[PDB]
């Protein structure tokens, strides 16, 4: 019903290409600038996507990238609000990243937490929360994107949480072994997302490989405090990385913590070369 015609969409410039798809800046009717994400055929069933898209329509928040329209027929097109600065991973690794400091990054972290807090309130699970799926816009605005599409993926390796098409490094152990995805498992991913911010886009568990990570995490290995990062922020990461999901923090707590970080947690902060 929210379906639209393909001819309505013009794909102008390719922002990115991914494992299951690519993303384009475009025009929706010659009037509306939009982001168009396209999935390769055989990624997910169109009925399943439409069923899920109903839920995606339900989810509305200012820190969530808002769905505009879809094309059910393969290749499936997802049409959403355009974000000017592209991916968070793109932004951090970009020229602007050098000018980013801890207050900016914590603020960016806070916005993500605010969107997830809404998702937490809505009893929903993202299943793949990381910098790649964060979108940045003008004035350092960060919004969470691509929620709910992880479940719909039909890839055989991906289903078993295996095969390097899977973001195992961001994935909580209980959700990796047994595939139990909760808002709590998202909190684990968020802690990993915090690493991406404070390292300005470095891949998690550097030097380790996807096979290596799960056993290391299982035996209690956790990522060390990043350079120029306050131990207090790193402690927050560790809370997110607790083995028992129940003792991991809520997104509501996270949002307030990040928002009040420089008055309540680190009032005596001084900027460094990186942070």
């Amino acid at each position: 019903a929210w379906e639209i015609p393909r001819e309505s969409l013009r794909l102008e410039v390719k922002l990115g290409q991914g494992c299951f798809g690519e993303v384009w800046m475009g025009t929706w009717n010659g009037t509306t600038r939009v982001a168009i994400k396209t999935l390769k055929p055989g990624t997910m069933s169109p009925e399943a996507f439409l069923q899920e898209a109903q839920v995606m329509k339900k989810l509305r928040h200012e820190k969530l990238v808002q769905l505009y329209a879809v094309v059910s027929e393969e290749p499936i097109y997802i049409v959403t609000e355009y974000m000017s600065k592209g991916s968070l991973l793109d932004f951090l690794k970009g020229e602007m990243g050098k000018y980013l400091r801890l207050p900016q990054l914590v603020d960016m972290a806070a916005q993500i937490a605010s969107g997830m807090a809404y998702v937490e309130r809505m009893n929903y699970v993202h299943r793949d929360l990381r910098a790649a799926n964060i979108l940045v816009g003008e004035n350092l605005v960060c919004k969470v994107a691509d929620f709910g599409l992880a479940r719909l993926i039909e890839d055989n390796e991906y289903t078993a949480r295996q095969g390097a098409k899977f973001p195992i490094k961001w994935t909580a152990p209980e959700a990796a072994l047994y595939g139990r995805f909760t808002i709590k498992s998202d909190v684990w991913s968020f802690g990993i997302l915090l690493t991406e911010l404070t390292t300005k886009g470095r891949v998690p568990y550097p030097g380790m490989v996807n096979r290596e990570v799960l056993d290391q995490v299982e035996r209690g290995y956790r990522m060390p405090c990043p350079p120029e990062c306050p131990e207090s922020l790193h402690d927050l990461m560790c809370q997110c990385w607790r083995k028992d999901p129940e003792e991991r923090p809520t997104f509501e707590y996270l949002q307030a913590f990040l928002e009040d970080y420089f008055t309540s947690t680190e009032p005596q902060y001084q900027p460094g070369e990186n942070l």
Partner: peptide, 4 residues
């Protein structure tokens, strides 16, 4: 997913 879209941005490997």
């Amino acid at each position: 997913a879209f941005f490997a």
